[PDB]
UniProtKB/TrEMBL annotation, chain B:
Superkingdom, natural source: Bacteria
Protein name: Oxidoreductase
Species of origin: Arthrobacter sp. U41
Source lineage: Bacteria, Bacillati, Actinomycetota, Actinomycetes, Micrococcales
Binding site for NAD(+) 1: 14-15, 36, 41, 77, 80, 99-100, 128, 165-166, 169, 182, 314
Residues the record lists as binding NAD(+) 2: 14-15, 36, 41, 77, 80, 99-100, 128, 165-166, 169, 182, 314
Keyword entries, A-Z: Nucleotide-binding
Amino acid sequence: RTIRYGLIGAGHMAREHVRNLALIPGSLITAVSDPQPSSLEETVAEIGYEVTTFPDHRELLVSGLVDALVIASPNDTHLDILKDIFSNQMKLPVLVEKPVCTTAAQADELESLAAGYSAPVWVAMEYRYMPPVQELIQAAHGGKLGNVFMLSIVEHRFPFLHKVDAWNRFNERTGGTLVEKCCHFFDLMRLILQDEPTRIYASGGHDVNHMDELYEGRVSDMIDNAYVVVDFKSGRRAMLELSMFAEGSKFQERISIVGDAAKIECLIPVAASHWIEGDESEAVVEFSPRSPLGPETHEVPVDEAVLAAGAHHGSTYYEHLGYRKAILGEGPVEVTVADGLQSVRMGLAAERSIIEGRPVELL
Amino acid sequence: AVRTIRYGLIGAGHMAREHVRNLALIPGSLITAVSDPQPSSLEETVAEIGYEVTTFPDHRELLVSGLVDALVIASPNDTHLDILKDIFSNQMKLPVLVEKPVCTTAAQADELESLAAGYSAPVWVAMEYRYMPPVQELIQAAHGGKLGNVFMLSIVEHRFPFLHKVDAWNRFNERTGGTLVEKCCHFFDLMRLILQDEPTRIYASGGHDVNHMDELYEGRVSDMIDNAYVVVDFKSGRRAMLELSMFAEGSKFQERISIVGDAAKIECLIPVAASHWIEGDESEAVVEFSPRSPLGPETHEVPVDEAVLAAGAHHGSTYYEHLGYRKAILGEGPVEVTVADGLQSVRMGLAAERSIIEGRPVELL
Ligand SMILES: NC(=O)c1ccc[n+]([C@@H]2O[C@H](COP(=O)([O-])OP(=O)(O)OC[C@H]3O[C@@H](n4cnc5c(N)ncnc54)[C@H](O)[C@@H]3O)[C@@H](O)[C@H]2O)c1
Ligand SMILES: NC(=O)c1ccc[n+]([C@@H]2O[C@H](COP(=O)([O-])OP(=O)(O)OC[C@H]3O[C@@H](n4cnc5c(N)ncnc54)[C@H](O)[C@@H]3O)[C@@H](O)[C@H]2O)c1
């Protein structure tokens, strides 16, 4: 059963989508849209076979060429493109890239519109499918840690990469760092702890990065490091640590979950495309029972092709298997617009916390 | 020539016995006097000393005994100020090593602050963690610029519930100052030390979620926190985060400290003390230096002298603390951990406890 995919936005992440679809039988890209032909040229080369291209998504939407959509355009364009999809005579499934939107007003508007749209809308927050992360989720959800109380997430990575039109350098286009980069983490918090946030507090700064990059004399206004503490309805708690100038760290992600029977932790290595050649490491998961003492540690292997197709530890592949099911009406949307909105509202509350030096309540 | 120092110990329990074992490694360290209102404690501690000393049920008799050149206080937290006041009113001007927390309440801190200013002999607050060999490496790297400008300091402690103590003194906030004072003053102090700056704002989320639920004390259950996340902002916009869990004793490494600067990151991992871990699964602490450019992390074990490590449960730190205190007693070095350091550490913990209760940040001066 073949699915005809249309890509709206044909840049870096789009090419990751391409390489992952290439690993899933019945995945045919038929249409790609991007206002920049140098992006289309690069992405079509990556596809490796002929597709129809369009400068504007609206022509793609009425092309008759597609069964399902993927949006990989800049964050602040997601709602506009979604609206055109929602108004289309053909109502198609959409995988829309993270952040689903970038402001509080966008979130409010998207919430009304998506509620009235009849086809699957999946927000492409894929980190839960990283095999190490899946192990932690199953351990937490399956009771192996006892009652869960704490979730720590540490991301230590390189500065935001250069992008088409330098779109990721200003809060006005990204929603802020804690939306652009940390929606994934706020979503993992809700997933792992199976609960809703009530309060968020963050300390953060723009302290290091992009100080030498000028746009009409102006520097990037985005955060490059933060600590965020999130309280939950049930009384569980989570903390996110982010540094966008800690690319020295062999393990880019550390996730720890502490319960009253055990702790579990994973370490996720820097993707091979950004690390030292040859010094390739697997992710590790450590299970640490309170009693009896005796931690268990294991490497978590990922299929070599799956890992090579993306920079997110094989997660994008699993994301597509799930989206495929949603497209064929054989499975649910696992990451919904509601999930995306919570993630964004959490990021937005964190950004406001940083500015105001007060915690921010969520309803 | 070993210079002999006559030490008086006030409080003769668990930590006192660690003090004893450490002094035993330092030539010229003679315990002459030990005070404790509980004879079972004196019996235990004298056996640990291994030679005869004069004992007193009350420190006030020890203070005027003429037997001592220097004091160590290892009594319960809420007694430290009272004992210090007796020392300050004595006309003997004896150096004191007073165990952390230096005090337990805001009113105690205000009072101690005025009184300590008028006392002319060394007062050292016994927050020893800086002398843990791996931690000293991180401090030197940070202070020496190997990380570039320092922005972030993460401290994670994953350990066992508070141990049972004499008179169960450590089960209520009223006696301990709260978990973030009793257990975390060490960490707030390391923050000030490493970042060389003062806190402006503290926010914490924490609870009493797991521990001591089956212990009753005149019908009451322990009111102390057993897990927390604390975020601390500093005048120079550096930031630190403390994560504590008192129910994560399965973790091989009880402490993790990471420091992130604009040139490099450094991290250390401190193993559970051998007296609390599995026999035979002994590991050393590890330090990893991670330069941003070029990529290439450097990892090494940080070995500790075997006798020093065996003498205490704080990775050799107590030994170095005593070498430092010895120097202060002899007028050959400064008090490295002052009453001001203790007060800041306590006030930070106190603010954190209040933050947890009130769900708001707390501003510090
Ligand atoms: N899920 C993940 O792990 C992950 C990783 C990286 C990026 N992303 C997301 O993917 C999206 C794209 O980021 P990127 O790194 O690929 O950026 P990029 O700059 O490489 O590519 C963006 C592309 O969008 C095109 N474009 C700009 N305006 C558009 C519009 N109005 N309609 C259609 N296309 C338009 C640009 O011409 C460019 O080709 C962002 O939302 C980003 O957050 C997700
Ligand atoms: N790493 C460290 O720096 C560290 C570690 C453990 C304990 N401590 C500190 O050491 C102190 C004692 O803790 P511990 O674990 O030894 O407890 P413990 O209960 O084992 O010993 C405390 C002793 O103090 C005695 N005592 C009670 N009231 C007294 C008073 N008014 N004057 C004199 N002695 C009195 C008790 O009888 C008991 O023998 C506390 O301040 C604690 O915070 C520090």
